[PDB]
Amino acid sequence: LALSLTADQMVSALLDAEPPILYSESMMGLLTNLADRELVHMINWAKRVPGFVDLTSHDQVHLLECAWLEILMIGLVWRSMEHPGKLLFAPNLLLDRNQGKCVEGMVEIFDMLLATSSRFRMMNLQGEEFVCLKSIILLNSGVYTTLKSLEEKDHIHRVLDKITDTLIHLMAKAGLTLQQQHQRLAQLLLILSHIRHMSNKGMEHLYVVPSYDLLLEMLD
Ligand X SMILES: CC1=C(c2cccc(O)c2)[C@H](c2ccc(I)cc2)Oc2ccc(O)cc21
Pick the piece of the chain touching ligand X (CB under 6 A) from 129-137, 146-154, 183-191, 205-213.
205-213
Binding-site string for its own copies from residue 172 to residue 211, where x marks contact by CB under 8 A and - marks none? ------xx-xxx-xxx-xxxxxxxxx--xx--x-------
The helix/strand/coil state of 16 is: helix
Is residue 114 packed enough to be buried (19+ CB in 10 Å), middle (13-18) or exposed (0-12)?
buried
Query: What CA–CA distance (Å, rounded) separates 111 from 85?
Result: 9
Please list, residue by residue across 156-171, b when 16 or more beta carbons sit within 10 angstroms of its beta carbon and e when fewer do.
beebbebbeebbbbbb
Minimum CB separation of residue 197 from ligand X in Å reads: 13
Residue 69's contacts (CB-CB under 8 Å, 6 or more residues apart) are 199, 202, 203
Q: Is residue 128 near ligand ODY by the rule CB under 6 A?
A: no
Q: How many CB atoms lie within 10 A of CB 23?
A: 12
Minimum CB separation of residue 187 from ligand X in Å reads: 22
| DSSP label at residue 3 | G
Residue 122 or 207 having the CB closest to ligand X:
207
Q: Is residue 76 near ligand ODY by the rule CB under 6 A?
A: yes
What is the footprint of its own copies within residues 116-145 (CB under 8 A)?
116, 119, 136, 140-141, 144-145
Q: Is residue 32 near ligand X by the rule CB under 6 A?
A: yes
Annotated binding site: 38, 79, 205
Interface contacts to ligand X, rule CB under 6 A: 31-32, 34-35, 38, 72-73, 75-76, 89, 106, 109, 202, 205-206, 208
